[PDB]
Ligand binder design. Structure first.
Ligand SMILES: Nc1nc2c(ncn2[C@@H]2O[C@H](COP(=O)(O)OP(=O)(O)OP(=O)(O)O)[C@@H](O)[C@H]2O)c(=O)[nH]1
Ligand SMILES: COc1cc(OC)c(/C=C/S(=O)(=O)Cc2ccc(OC)c(NCC(=O)O)c2)c(OC)c1
Ligand SMILES: Nc1ncnc2c1ncn2[C@@H]1O[C@H](COP(=O)(O)OP(=O)(O)CP(=O)(O)O)[C@@H](O)[C@H]1O
Ligand SMILES: Nc1nc2c(ncn2[C@@H]2O[C@H](COP(=O)(O)OP(=O)(O)O)[C@@H](O)[C@H]2O)c(=O)[nH]1
Ligand SMILES: [Ca+2]
Ligand SMILES: [Mg+2]
Ligand SMILES: [Mg+2]
Ligand SMILES: [Mg+2]
Lengths: 420, 437, 54, 347
């Protein structure tokens, strides 16, 4: 379990993926040109997890960039770390997906998916021990949601024994592009419920709320939201990328975080929120204000939790504070899964900050988010509003009713396990 | 002389084996390159230590061991460590992808692909034995390899060497020092699968070793190195009778004879004293009576439980260092007066005592202080059933909801194996209750 | 308090002390169960591929 | 703050204990099966001692001493007193008792001894199963007692019935004394200042032994089968102030001198005997426990131990003061926050 294959699809997918790659490239001492100028060998011990070692001792991200439009990928190529990516790993069309799930999944995306899979196959062949794939995308648009889910399905068909991990950005009316985002999201969630092992639910509502009422940003841009996202992705991948007592990999994570196959949607959390003592780190990261999914964990229960503390700190006080938070919040953890909280410490803090903490919770409170989507979905579907956009691509009403039913079922399963 | 073969499975088994073989080399005067200057018979011998070390024409003393892991990094550390030249490259066997803390992966999917290779390596070691007593198997309950692959290997060893004895050293899982949430499942699955194939099993609870390190060594957050050096001290106490000239427990069958009156009740409780920090500049060397009494303090046990509330079936005292029978007998009479030691009626109330004059050996630059005398007590007491109960309860909490079961079924197991293993454990607890009160 | 069977050598001594007196599956089955598990897993994988094909 | 779980739903004392703990504001009450607790108010049967003291970062305390049952079951107590050197068969404060390993054969011998002298040969058959004040027969003939023992399925003990008991007047009525004792985690032995006298409402009678109400002084039996209940004293229960006053007025002595010294001695002897078996001083969890000691007082102002209750009920009038005391001494001592009501029996 060494190499991970990274896939970013659509506008949101590629923007957050670009920021992820520049953040971790900085952490590993890799510059925009792909050459290593770091000071610690710890930056290179597991660098193969995300980078291929090319000729001349250059490191190239094991990343595939996908879109049905050339714009966002042009801007990526033009960006700071744009030259770092493998040129023929850019796979894109011209037509676009029109924020339409059917276009990304059934019509437009169908033409490009095999070329994408060819690049994925080439990246996987060079792998000594492939862990699986991580995909960055949004669920509200067309390319990320429709085509990313199509890609996930085809990849699972070709690699049924590898881990499928996604960073999935959920839509909210507070940061809405079009009224059809709930449709696109519901259709995507069904796919995600069946074909991923782990999904980090990045809620645009939560990111906006954090930017507005905590970072005091009056008018939050997409870049502001993305900064939070990249901090979260760095935190959540820290133990995959650096040597630690944990020796973490995607499969161990899945096995220890996912007690029931369908309930694999995690709420990330981060502290401190930016644009600090261990007790503060622990209290903040468990604070709802620090949640990236816009759900109140005090409205549900944690099935499992995984947390990393980064910096120079006493692991003893980290243990003490984690136990203290569990005891002071005993009601919000299920009692029938013993020892369901895992903690690690990494001596290398992220850039600019001396102490930080990242949190992954498999909470039943995530049901709130799905409820939110479902309602927004039904309010339009009950009137069949905007359906012609999708029926013109060949879809039937039955498929919508099926996606709706699957998501309401998911909500009811979360509710079932919330009542122990 | 009769050889013994050590088998170290999974991370816990491999690292504990590293500690153990370091300690053995120190105790027998074998250097990291395998040369043993005190050995005057070159390329062979009939000595007691030859039960654990074969010899090469070049005078190299080679452990009779195989290290197995489904992942390669941990055994890589042995290949490139202080004792790299101690082992033959074929002794260290690794795969590429581990069991992912999943008993089903270790036992069925991944293990099946490597069992024949491991058996071939083990046969390669066995063919060098004039007489082979059996195997010592080191593994954790909690890991996917340590549980699943160890159970598979134990079944195959029963098939291949039915006559031979199989002794276990098992790490019982603890939240203070844990790697997986599903460690209870694995623990039960392997126990049920291994129970009829193991003749005697020494359980070490990570919680007990952790607390002993914290308490007696003043180590705030013990590492696997600390835990493993203490465990190696206990294991060395248990195997010294196999490696040195003596009269008690001089062959693997004797462990079953002396410690195990019933086949399924084959989990003796180990207690060890004294554990003293190397850093303490002031130290008061403890007498025979003191360490013997410490043997009856729950805080010094390898598993936390209360022997006062169980019954003894056998009790064995293994001393090392400045100890003569006179003091042992006096201390035993004192303790018998001062303690609650009830044996089962169908067994005699007696202790079997062994004294090795060589004091305990410590790793230079370790946390354990050098002491003039030490003692490991091995008592087969029903109180250890507490551990089983604890473990079973955790299992029950998760299995009632089928939490995580899908990971095992997806590898080819059936829920029926879960319920069958849990029933076997309930029967085991029933047996312990019947023998005890 | 009776001491019995005292043995001495240069490495040490051993003895016993009485304070009071008293009052397998064949290889065929292994292969069969391993392959039954593998057949269950093969069936599950084929079910997944059937679903993906539809 | 602190957490505690309740597993003995129907016990007055610890119902009040949990009430007061919650009222302190610094204690949460979890579900019965939640393992992350500081305090367990456990069940009376099969309390899972094997599971306590294994939660990292949690100091765990339980209101029962594993092994104390040896003191609180009748036959077990008789065997403990007979086989324990600390308090031998010659110990003077426990009546001549035989378990029925069977002791019938050795009981018939003492019965024959009885027969030679005119001294009374009245005995009482007892069982641990008869908690509901029934399962006892008092007769001078041993064959009757043994026939009863055989008719009953449970295991029994025969005691020497105190034919000359200390009698209160007015009334000529028997009684027994209940003293409450708290053993904390350090094995301090605290005797509650207030004890109770369960008084036979209907006068004593040496002639007939089937007069069950005048021979058996239990609150339930007295309430159900005695014609007058609360005639002499309220609730058929006397408290140490008025009992001491009566001792002074009638016998010119004090409760402390004539009775309480022996009671303190018996409590100390019993609880020091079993200390090595049940102490938790070096255990991964701590125990405290409340006991109810029952005594008789004979005509010569001698005190006899009858039975030890490990799951004792209190007296309505005292529940408040004692329960609080428990918290202050047994619970809050291990879990702090924010003149005594006990007597320390030192040792
Ligand atoms: N005492 C001690 N316990 C260990 C050590 N290494 C792991 N453990 C314990 O073993 C259990 C985990 O099993 P591992 O041995 O790490 O797993 P494995 O056998 O390699 O199997 P995989 O799941 O495939 O990795 C946990 O309870 C750990 O606390 C060690 O070096 N010393
Ligand atoms: C915040 O970003 C994290 C990412 C992680 O992965 C990529 C892990 C974790 C990696 S891992 O490889 O250790 C697998 C794992 C996970 C959770 C567990 O508990 C719920 C356990 N079991 C431990 C127990 O018994 O409590 C094991 C993480 O958490 C230390 C944090
Ligand atoms: N040897 C004896 N001599 C005189 N009276 C005796 C006696 N043994 C028992 N009794 C009487 O028996 C009555 C009840 O006995 P005991 O208390 O042992 O039974 P019990 O345990 O069911 C009720 P509790 O446990 O609540 O006190 C007492 O009031 C006592 O007077
Ligand atoms: N957080 C975040 N969300 C975005 C970003 N870009 C688009 N989105 C969201 O993603 C959804 C739009 O999908 P988009 O990715 O633009 O469509 P695609 O290109 O067709 O996949 C809407 O919910 C947008 O709010 C971004 O940079 N950051
Ligand atoms: Ca030799
Ligand atoms: Mg867009
Ligand atoms: Mg491993
Ligand atoms: Mg009673």
């Amino acid at each position: 379990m060494r190499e991970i294959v990274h896939i970013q699809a659509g506008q949101c997918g590629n923007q957050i993926g670009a920021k992820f790659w520049e953040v971790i490239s900085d952490e590993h001492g890799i510059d925009p040109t792909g050459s290593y100028h770091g000071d610690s060998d710890l930056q290179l011990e597991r660098i193969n997890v995300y980078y291929n070692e090319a000729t001349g001792n250059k490191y190239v991200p094991r990343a595939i960039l996908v879109d049905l439009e050339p714009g966002t990928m042009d801007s990526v190529r033009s960006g700071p770390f744009g030259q770092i990516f493998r040129p023929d790993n850019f796979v894109f069309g011209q037509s676009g997906a029109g924020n339409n799930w059917a276009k990304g999944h059934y019509t437009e995306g169908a033409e490009l998916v095999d070329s994408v899979l060819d690049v994925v196959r080439k990246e996987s062949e060079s792998c000594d021990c492939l862990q699986g794939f991580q995909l960055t995308h949004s669920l509200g648009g067309g390319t990320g949601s429709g085509m990313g889910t199509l890609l996930i399905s085809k990849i699972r068909e070709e690699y049924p024994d590898r881990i499928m991990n996604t960073f999935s950005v959920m839509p909210s009316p507070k940061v809405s592009d079009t009224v059809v985002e709930p449709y696109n999201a519901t259709l995507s969630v069904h796919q995600l419920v069946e074909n991923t092992d782990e999904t980090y639910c990045i809620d645009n509502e939560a990111l906006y709320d954090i930017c507005f009422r905590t970072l005091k940003l009056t008018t939050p841009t997409y870049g502001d939201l993305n900064h939070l996202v990249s901090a979260t992705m760095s935190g959540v991948t820290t133990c995959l990328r650096f040597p630690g007592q944990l020796n973490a990999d995607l499969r161990k994570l899945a096995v220890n975080m996912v007690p029931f196959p369908r309930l694999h949607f995690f709420m990330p959390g981060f502290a401190p929120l930016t644009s600090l003592t261990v007790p503060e780190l622990t209290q903040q990261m468990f604070d709802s204000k620090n949640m990236m999914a816009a759900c109140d964990p005090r409205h549900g229960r944690y099935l499992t939790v995984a947390a990393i503390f980064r910096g120079r700190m006493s692991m003893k006080e980290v243990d003490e504070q984690m136990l203290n938070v569990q005891n002071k919040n005993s009601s919000y953890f299920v009692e029938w899964i013993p020892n369901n909280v895992k903690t690690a410490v990494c001596d290398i803090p992220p850039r600019g900050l001396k102490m930080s903490a990242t949190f992954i919770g498999n909470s039943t409170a995530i049901q709130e988010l799905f409820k939110r989507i479902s309602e927004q979905f039904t309010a339009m579907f009950r009137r069949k509003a905007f359906l012609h956009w999708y029926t013109g691509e060949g879809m039937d009403e039955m498929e919508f009713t099926e996606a709706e039913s699957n998501m309401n079922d998911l909500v009811s399963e979360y509710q079932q396990y919330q009542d122990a | 002389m009769r050889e013994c073969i050590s088998i170290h499975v999974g991370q816990a088994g491999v690292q504990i084996g590293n500690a153990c073989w370091e300690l053995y080399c120190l105790e027998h005067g074998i250097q990291p390159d395998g040369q043993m200057p005190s050995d005057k018979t070159i390329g062979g011998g009939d000595d007691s230590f030859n039960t654990f070390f074969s010899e090469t024409g070049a005078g190299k003393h080679v452990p009779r061991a195989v290290f197995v892991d489904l992942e390669p990094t941990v055994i890589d550390e042995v290949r490139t460590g202080t004792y790299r030249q101690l082992f033959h490259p074929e002794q260290l066997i690794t795969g590429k992808e581990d069991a992912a803390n999943n008993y089903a992966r270790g036992h069925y999917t991944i293990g099946k692909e490597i069992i024949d290779l491991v058996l071939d390596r083990i046969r390669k070691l066995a063919d060098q034995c004039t007489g082979l007593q059996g195997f010592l198997v080191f593994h954790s309950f909690g890991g996917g390899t340590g549980s699943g692959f160890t159970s598979l290997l134990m079944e195959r060893l029963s098939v291949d060497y039915g006559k031979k004895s199989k002794l276990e050293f098992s790490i019982y899982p603890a939240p203070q020092v844990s790697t997986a949430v599903v460690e209870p499942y694995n623990s039960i699955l392997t126990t049920h699968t291994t129970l009829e194939h193991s003749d005697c099993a020494f359980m070490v609870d990570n919680e007990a070793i952790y607390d002993i390190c914290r308490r007696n060594l003043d180590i705030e957050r013990p590492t696997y190195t600390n835990l493993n050096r203490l465990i190696s001290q206990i294991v060395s106490s248990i195997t010294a009778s196999l490696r040195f000239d003596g009269a008690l427990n001089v062959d693997l069958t004797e462990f079953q004879t002396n410690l195990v009156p019933y086949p399924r009740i084959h989990f003796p409780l180990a207690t060890y004293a004294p554990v003293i920090s190397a850093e303490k500049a002031y130290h008061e060397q403890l007498s025979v009576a003191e360490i013997t009494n410490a043997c009856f303090e729950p805080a010094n046990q390898m598993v936390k439980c209360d022997p006062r509330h169980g019954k003894y079936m056998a009790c064995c005292l293994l001393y090392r260092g400045d100890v003569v029978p006179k003091d042992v007998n006096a201390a035993i009479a004192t303790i018998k007066t001062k303690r609650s030691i009830q044996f089962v009626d169908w067994c005699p109330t007696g202790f079997k005592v062994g004294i090795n004059y060589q004091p305990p050996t410590v790793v230079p630059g370790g946390d354990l202080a050098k002491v003039q005398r030490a003692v490991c007590m091995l008592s087969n007491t029903t109180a250890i059933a507490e551990a089983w109960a604890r473990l079973d309860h955790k299992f029950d909490l998760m299995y009632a909801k089928r939490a995580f079961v899908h990971w095992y079924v997806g590898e080819g197991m059936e829920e029926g194996e879960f319920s069958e293993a849990r029933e076997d454990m309930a029967a085991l607890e029933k047996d312990y209750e019947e023998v005890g009160v | 308090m009776e001491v019995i069977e005292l043995n001495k050598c240069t490495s040490g001594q051993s003895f016993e002390v009485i304070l009071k007196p008293p009052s397998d599956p064949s290889l065929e089955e292994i292969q069969k169960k391993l392959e039954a598990a593998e057949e269950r897993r093969k069936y599950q994988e084929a079910e997944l591929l059937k679903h993906l094909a539809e | 703050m602190y957490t505690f779980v309740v597993r003995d739903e129907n016990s007055s004392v610890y119902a009040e204990v949990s009430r007061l703990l919650l009222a302190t504001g610094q204690w949460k009450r979890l579900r019965k099966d939640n393992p992350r607790f500081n305090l367990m108010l456990g069940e009376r049967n099969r309390l899972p001692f094997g599971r306590l003291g294994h939660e990292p970062g949690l100091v765990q305390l339980v209101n029962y001493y594993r092994g104390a049952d040896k003191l609180c079951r009748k036959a077990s107590l008789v065997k403990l007193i007979k086989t324990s050197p600390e308090l031998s068969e010659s110990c003077t404060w426990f009546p001549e008792s035989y378990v029925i390993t069977d002791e019938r054969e050795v009981f018939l011998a003492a019965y024959n001894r009885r027969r030679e002298g005119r001294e009374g040969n009245v005995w009482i058959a007892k069982s641990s199963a008869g908690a509901k004040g029934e399962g006892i027969l008092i007769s001078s003939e041993a064959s009757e007692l043994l026939d009863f023992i055989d008719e009953q399925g449970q295991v029994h003990v025969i005691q020497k019935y105190l034919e000359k008991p200390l009698l209160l007047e007015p009334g000529h009525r028997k009684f027994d004394i209940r003293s409450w004792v708290l053993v904390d985690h350090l094995y301090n032995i605290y005797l509650y200042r207030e004890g109770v006298l369960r008084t036979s409402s209907e006068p004593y009678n040496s002639a007939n032994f089937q007069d069950k109400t005048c021979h058996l002084t239990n609150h339930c039996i007295q309430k159900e089968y005695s014609k007058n209940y609360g005639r002499y004293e309220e609730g058929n229960e006397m408290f140490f102030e008025e009992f001491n006053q009566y001792l002074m007025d009638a016998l010119n002595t004090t409760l402390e001198n004539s009775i309480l010294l022996q009671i303190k001695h018996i409590i100390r002897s019993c609880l020091m005997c079993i200390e090595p078996a049940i102490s938790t001083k070096h255990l991964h969890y701590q125990s405290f426990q409340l006991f109810g000691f029952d005594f008789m007082v004979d005509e010569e102002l001698k005190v006899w131990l009858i039975e030890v209750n490990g799951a004792p009920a209190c007296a309505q009038k005292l529940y408040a003061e004692l329960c609080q005391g428990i918290v202050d001494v047994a619970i809050s001592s291990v879990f702090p926050l924010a003149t005594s009501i006990f007597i320390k029996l030192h040792h």
